[PDB]
């Protein structure tokens, strides 16, 4: 099938403002809520930031997650399915620490009915999902100073591996003078990268593991 040469879900009103995780390893939770935020907009027309803190505090050991010490987007989604909801960010705001679970259905802002995992390393399948389903949660290998110091352009790091350690959100793809890239929303605030985003090399052999473990939820 025909796919667009480039996609940017921010232009479709499906991406909330960039968040700042602070000294808490909650990137997995931010990735998961970002993916679901897009699906909530696609279903209801509302663009609402969802509570990463809710996942940090409540999608814990039964889901294999360890709060500020890391987790998984897939089992974050499973928590939202099991729990029959996730709170809005406004009602359950982010504190960058581990807290008791404070979920309240009074402030439910979204639900989740399923999630899909994509095949390891398949950047073609990732492209199809980004084009036709929405932003996709992914892991990357971020354990390189070049990643934290990235300012602009298309990011390529020869030392990168396909082993992921940082959860982020693919919100589009494109090319910068024929250098193909993934448009990636991070959770390191607006001062990271290009106003909180990093363009990562695409079709360069699963660079930094971007397509190692993609997943996306549906409502």
């Amino acid at each position: 099938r025909i796919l667009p040469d480039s996609v940017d879900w921010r232009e479709k009103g499906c991406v909330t403002e960039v968040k700042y995780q602070g000294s808490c390893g909650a990137c997995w939770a931010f990735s998961a809520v970002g993916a679901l935020e897009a699906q909530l907009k696609l279903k209801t027309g509302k663009l609402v930031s969802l509570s990463a803190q809710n996942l940090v505090d409540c999608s814990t050991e039964k889901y294999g997650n360890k709060g500020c010490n890391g987790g998984f987007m897939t089992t974050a989604f499973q928590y939202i399915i099991d729990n029959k909801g996730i709170d809005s960010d406004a009602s359950y705001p982010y504190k960058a620490m581990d807290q008791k679970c404070q979920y309240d259905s009074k402030y439910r802002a979204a639900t989740c009915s399923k999630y899909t995992e994509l095949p390891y390393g398949r950047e073609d399948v990732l492209k199809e999902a980004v084009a036709n389903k929405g932003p996709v949660s992914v892991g990357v290998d971020a354990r390189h100073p070049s990643f934290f110091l990235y300012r602009s352009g298309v990011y390529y790091e020869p030392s990168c591996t396909q082993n992921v350690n940082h959860g982020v959100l693919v919100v589009g793809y494109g090319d910068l003078n024929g250098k193909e890239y993934w448009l990636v929303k991070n959770s390191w605030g607006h001062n990271f990268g290009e106003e909180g985003y990093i363009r990562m090399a695409r079709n360069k052999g699963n660079h930094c593991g971007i397509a190692s473990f993609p997943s996306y939820p549906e409502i």
Partner: peptide
């Protein structure tokens, strides 16, 4: 194969 997204 998936790594928790710890040593950070």
């Amino acid at each position: 194969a998936k790594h928790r997204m710890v040593m950070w």
